[model samples]
Target chain A: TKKAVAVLKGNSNVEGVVTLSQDDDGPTTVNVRITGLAPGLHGFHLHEYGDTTNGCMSTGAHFNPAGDLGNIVANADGVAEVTLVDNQIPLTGPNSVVGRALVVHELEDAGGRLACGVVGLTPI
Target chain B: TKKAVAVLKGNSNVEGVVTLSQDDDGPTTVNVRITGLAPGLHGFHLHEYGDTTNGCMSTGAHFNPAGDLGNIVANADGVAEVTLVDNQIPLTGPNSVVGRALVVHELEDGRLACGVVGLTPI
Candidate 1:
């Protein structure tokens, strides 16, 4: 089994945590918990770069394997709690997200990217 | 005379430069030049903390000395070039911006905060 974690950060009060885990031949499960966002739907995707030396702008575009994962809806109190599964994103493979970044945008229409976190390995 | 600079950064390719300088008995001059932005108005202001440890979110609220400077208008080619003078922002005072951060937002009202590239001394 393998696992990873990302601690999201942004310019606003937005903050979140994402956990990824995989076991055997099953799909990788992505669990997310976020807060301090505006009440609405927001764009959530994996970005290409993990370099925060220049902040989220240097993180590049979405990490599209088959396609984008699209929006994640937040509650009226600015909270998003959800889970997803994808087979393309692996914890250990050529298409691994270990050095990439995960971003949360301001709107579902691809507004300004609100927060970001670098994906890295964690103890299982 | 003393000077400081901040490099604005964001996720959407928005990049810019902000320069702050002061002379003897004169107001601080702020010169700004930006590119790769959406064509229109954007919020530009001095923020409280200089900490980019958690990106721009840790920079706190706008550094309102005598209130805010309002918005900055970008040209059709996604460029903004403007200069303003303010007496409240000082180079060597109790309320100095020496360890502060300068932010440029996606909107004119400072809603969506952008990223910061680096800070340079001038």
Candidate 2:
């Protein structure tokens, strides 16, 4: 079983990390742990890239390497959820994610600017 | 030495949880864990309420209880990063986030609709 750690570093008000652990039971399972929230609810996500250069705003689009837009349609095998303005894609299959960056934003994906954090998959 | 957990559920392509654990040291440390990704990068965030009724398109407008709009700007005490089309508000202070929700979306939050989850601080 391989494990990956996603570190999220905000400019001033945000800071945290999201670790990815995979288990071989029947289907792969992901465990997300969060801490250091500003005593209130803050939006989070896996940006398109791991580049925090644009502060929290440069996290770019969500990790949709497939070049797909909008929700992936729930229960579509590769889909996770489609409710509001957020999207939680599934992380199934082996080695399906090896070069994508994890992103965290302040607000929901309102297509606006906000805090951001970049993370990449490393051998753990 | 208190620990908290936040679970997120969506309609189409979103389902997970975010746990909160505090370590007593000098400034207290926090950790976030993520799993079950769809082999690609997806947007994630904390919402205002723990109500996932809006499907993947009703996560609310981030976690800005202050009733702020757009990005919170960087280095502004509670601002993390402010560059792209997303905002990452700060999750600090004690009991500040005792009543809020964590949300996830598909796109970069173009103010449309997507996936989401509701999580409250315990």
Candidate 3:
């Protein structure tokens, strides 16, 4: 399994851990343990250099630099625990996501940018 | 597939992220990306609480308070990037490693850094 982890920190609105795991060339599994939030759905994504520029196309994945993992729901405890497998991100080779950014946007607010963690490659 | 993430950080001595992912009942894949280390093999484990010692000695699956995932080797840049599959830890269920502590020990001395295993979005 190819693996990587991102420690969610910085003067952001949330604190948690984002671990990435993959088996062979299959979908990379994303697991999260986060805290400090308001219960609701928040937009989460693997962004393009951690910057947003939604023109005809910025310069990156989804639009050239995004893997929009959709939104994650937090419970009443201000926590969001999730287990998801996605085919957009990879853990090895050229297009690997190491050193990228893992972002949690605002709850339903396109305004995004609540918390961020640089997707660091974890050594196993 | 089930998944979870743990950001390895604290006043300990290291900085990194630990991700846990699983496909059904298979071994939990442990992936990591961490910084701040001396180029060498560091003792790694999932501790009991997040405490330094005591209550963290279980040779069972990672030894319980101890999921000894073995040691991690860092490079000259003092960084480690790894992918390992473990059959002891799980993402869900009663004995899950969600809220536990992902710890890295020093290769020559004592503990290095520790982080809380919190819930995250995958």
Candidate 4:
């Protein structure tokens, strides 16, 4: 098995964690549990690149866009939680998200980038 | 040592990265490198919170105005780069950027792209 994590971070009290895991060459499970957020829909996705030399600006494109991950909603207490199985993104090979970035956006095309972290392999 | 990274993203092919680094407790080094732009001056700044549930709209005010950080310009190839230092925006503190966003905007201030600043290693 393989594992990776992107510790979600950004301004204010906003914080959370995103994890991607796999048992072999099959589906990668995405577990996102966040807190210190506003209640509403937030855009979540894996980006094309994990390069943050310019910050979130270098993440470029979408690992794949409405691509697959779709939108996530937070509760009145400001926590967004969910788990998803992904076949489009694995934890291995040329199609892996290991070197890319996982980003959380505001809403639709109207908000700004909120949380971001580089997706890197972790010990299983 | 303390370090932070913002992997910028948003609309179009517009993309870039921003780094906030410090050795010891001295000033924080700010680096900006970006590409695939429109070839012109763009506004760059840190916002109030890293919250983006509503997008850039909720990034709220500036980290400080001028809240410090200024603008960057893209070359003919649509690339922008610069490095600056600040004693204000540290990686750890009440006045820090560790949980905030670094935003890039159009010359007219239209939000282009942004990344939340998160800790990386030294």
Candidate 5:
């Protein structure tokens, strides 16, 4: 689904990679890197926006940073602006969230509709 | 009861080892290392110490950080200082804090002592 993927260093406490792809005009990317982790995969996602404060509660709403009703998963027609799909951030490629906090969850992100900590990146 | 020791390596998160001795007019030391760990050493100490945060409470009162009732520990011919042993902190050797944090107490540190978070040694 993506064009490129890059793996970061696997120290004793963290692991994972990022990916990227081309978009409509050029390439819409999202770099996904995780750190300060426990173990195992957590419910990951590109939050609607930013704010890594208060253990993470301050990260605002899902990528919906706008409070709209769009999901992260989009369609092929490119008409869905309210889903992670339309917001498909390139994972690897050139632009990414490497060296960022990829918070791990105790559970999985079923969807922004029912998760607490959405996945993304954090820096050490 | 006095010498020198050193380790401080092994990563994934962090690790350490420090020690040293002499005093009574010579040397005395301790060094303990640890990293972004998640597998062990959660409740280690050197406190009677300082501050770390809110989840860590602010680290105020212990090395008493001043508010002392006198409980760190100290003894031999010297005197017992108070309790915590006048506060001993030599882990692996000589005067240390080597790249600190040392706060891994999900719980542990009882005694006039109870921990939360510590240093972040740079």
Candidate 6:
């Protein structure tokens, strides 16, 4: 098995953790748990850079391995929880998300980035 | 020797790295290298919390060990590089800044959540 994690951060009150894992021949699993967000649907995706030099803007655009993976909706309390399994991202190899960034946007309509986290080996 | 590090994050273009280190019998050395800032002086200080949920605001007030350490000056290109040695902060002990935040302000008000501190891997 292989795994990685990201701790999201930014200017807004948004905070969260994202996990990516794989077991044997299974597809990669993405588990996201977040809070302190605006209540609504917001864009979610892997970004090109892990740089936080200029907030999420330093992370570049969406990571499209195949196509967009889409958005996540937050409840009235600004909490969002979701699990997704897919083949576009791998735990190892060329398409691995390690060293990149995970981004949460302000809205589902291509709004500005709200928060970001760098994907890396789970810290010991 | 003991040391800790921080990665600065904020809404404006400000970005940088902060390092804290202590030797056998001297004050803790504070070294900062930042870029993408607006020109002129910006308030810089150690804050109370390491939390960045609401940017630097969540990190609390200037970590007043004795009094304010004052502001950092940015060049016309929005870059600031400085080094200071102070005894108020400890790298290891009761007054350690191990889990606190380092902040940079846009002005004297220090109202905006400009930057935050986070421990970096050795």
DockQ of each: 0.02, 0.02, 0.03, 0.06, 0.02, 0.05
Cα deviation at B28, candidate 3, in Å, is 36
Calculate model 2's interface RMSD in Å: 13.8
**Best candidate, TM-score:** 6
What DockQ score does model 6 reach against the true complex?
Answer: 0.05
Per-residue alpha-carbon lDDT of model 2 for A1-124, expressed as tens digits?
A: 6443444445554334444545442232333333443333334455554333345554456555332222212122321222222123333332233223444333332433333322222233
Best by lDDT: 4
Candidate 5, CAPRI quality class derived from DockQ: incorrect
lDDT of 3 by residue, B69-104 (tens): 888889999899899988988755546564456777
* Per-residue C-alpha lDDT of model 4 across residues B6-116, encoded as one tens digit per residue: 777776578787878897678989989988878988888887655444456655678772564767889999999889887778765545565567788887347777766
What's the TM-score of each model vs. the native?
Answer: 0.50, 0.33, 0.47, 0.52, 0.23, 0.53
Candidate 3's error at A75, in angstroms?
0.3
Off by over 4 Å in 3: A50-66, B1-122
**Prediction 5 TM-score vs. true:** 0.23
4 or 6, greater by lDDT: 4
Show the lowest summed lDDT stretch of 10 residues, model 1 chain A: A91-100
Interface RMSD, in order shown:
10.7, 13.8, 11.8, 8.6, 15.9, 7.7
For residues A1-124, write the lDDT of model 1, one tens digit per residue. 9776667887778999887889855688999888988898888888865545466786777776542566888999999999988876676554666546778989885688788866644446
Per-residue error for B114 in candidate 2, Å, reads: 35
Residue B1 error for model 4, in Å?
A: 1.6
lDDT ranking from best candidate downward = 4, 1, 6, 3, 2, 5
Per-residue alpha-carbon lDDT of candidate 3 for residues A7-110, written as tens digits (9 for 90 to 100)? 55444568778888888778988998788877898877775432112211111233133477878889999899999888878755546565356777666635
Q: Is candidate 2 or candidate 6 better by TM-score?
A: 6
* Candidate 6 residue pairs in backbone clash: none
Output the better candidate (4/5) by TM-score: 4
